[PDB]
């Protein structure tokens, strides 16, 4: 008993999509992270704050422009390939029923079915140079994250240098977080890889999680944010991410309680980058399954290829018929391709967001 799992191009169209969908989700992450200044602003709050902002502005470049264009260009690649496929197969099998033998490159039906595969090969060529442009522009925008990202950590980590008498309370945070961190992106790694169609019903949770005591938009708190995406089909829920930040910083809430209110701000200042980490290990595994995206074009051109060199050889059209590539196993995996395709394209991503706060004990 197993769902039937993902054909191989169902499989790399699936997670292309869906690793770039968990980026979308952790941009909103960044956009929920906050921080308030408190009673008595510091003369450094001013410019930390400044490079939140700018980690924010390339989360939102992402979310208002680049994303909806990568996630639409991965399942539209497939779909808008399918016209002239159907059409090159068809021609293909008709070129075959009326002369099943024919051989030669002199043949004329050999003539047609290699120029039919050639066009096809050259339609296949473009598309993988569209996929390897798709993650180019990717790669670009991620070094301008990954630079925000840095310099967040970078005043965040020297702030922290310079109030004594911290630096354990510190380390026990950002232990804390790193623990959330690693769980949350394992909801989103398992559901990237899922070998099962994720379906229609997909949905991203948004939140604020509180590091302070005091809450969003009162004096000295701060907010890191998470994010997961999820589908009816497969599953994170709120209760899901609730139970998971009251494991990691059940004891953080215990500790942050004996300090005053502007050290647990100080405090919780790694916060402020937890969501753009995020998104950087998105970028990561982003990156990763577009390149299997491109690579499924890639094999699908060197097959067809491989098909013009045997024509071109003297292999006859039964011997073209037995190809793989041509085979009605082949056809029926791509048809399964496009409907999910279709069925990725169509989806509309639903997002829900809360501000969350850690349970004490």
Not at 118 to 141: C, F, P, R, Y
Not at 143 to 170: E, F, R, S, W
Not at 246 to 268: G, H, L, R, T, V
Request: hydrophobic residues 45%.
């Amino acid at each position: 008993q197993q769902v039937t799992q993902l054909n191989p191009t169902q499989q790399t169209t699936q997670s292309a999509f869906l690793a770039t969908t968990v980026i979308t989700a952790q941009c909103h992450a960044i956009l929920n992270t906050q921080f308030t200044p408190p009673t008595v602003k510091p003369d450094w709050f001013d410019d930390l704050s400044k490079k939140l902002d700018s980690a924010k502005l390339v989360a939102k470049q992402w979310i208002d422009d680049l994303g909806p264009q990568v996630s639409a260009s991965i399942p539209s690649s497939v779909i808008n390939f399918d016209a002239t496929f159907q059409a090159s197969i068809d021609a293909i099998h008709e070129l075959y029923k009326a002369d099943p033998t024919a051989s030669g490159k002199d043949n004329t039906t050999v003539q047609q079915a290699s120029q039919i595969m050639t066009a096809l090969s050259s339609q296949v060529s473009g598309i993988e140079a569209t996929v390897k442009g798709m993650n180019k522009e990717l790669s670009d925008w991620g070094v301008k994250m990954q630079a925000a990202h840095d310099d967040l950590v970078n005043g965040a980590t020297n702030i922290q240098k310079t109030i004594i008498d911290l630096q354990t309370d510190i380390e026990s945070m950002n232990n804390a977080i790193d623990n959330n961190r690693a769980a949350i992106e394992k909801l989103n790694k398992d559901l990237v890889y899922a070998q099962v169609a994720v379906g229609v019903g997909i949905f991203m949770l948004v939140a604020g999680v509180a590091l302070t005591v005091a809450t969003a938009g009162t004096a000295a708190a701060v907010s890191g944010g998470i994010a997961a995406v999820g589908a009816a089909s497969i599953g994170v829920t709120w209760g899901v991410l609730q139970n998971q930040i009251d494991d990691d910083y059940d004891s953080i809430a215990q500790e942050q309680k004996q300090k005053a209110e502007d050290q647990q701000q100080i405090i919780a200042l790694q916060g402020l980058s937890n969501a753009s980490s995020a998104v950087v290990s998105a970028i990561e595994t982003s990156t990763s399954v577009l390149s299997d995206f491109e690579t499924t074009w890639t094999v699908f051109g060197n097959e067809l290829d491989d098909v013009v060199t045997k024509l071109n050889n003297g292999a006859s059209m039964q011997s073209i018929i037995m190809e793989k590539v041509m085979s009605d196993a082949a056809k029926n995996e791509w048809d399964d391709a496009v409907e999910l395709a279709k069925q990725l394209a169509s989806a509309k991503i639903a997002i829900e967001t809360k501000e969350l706060a850690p349970a004490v004990k």
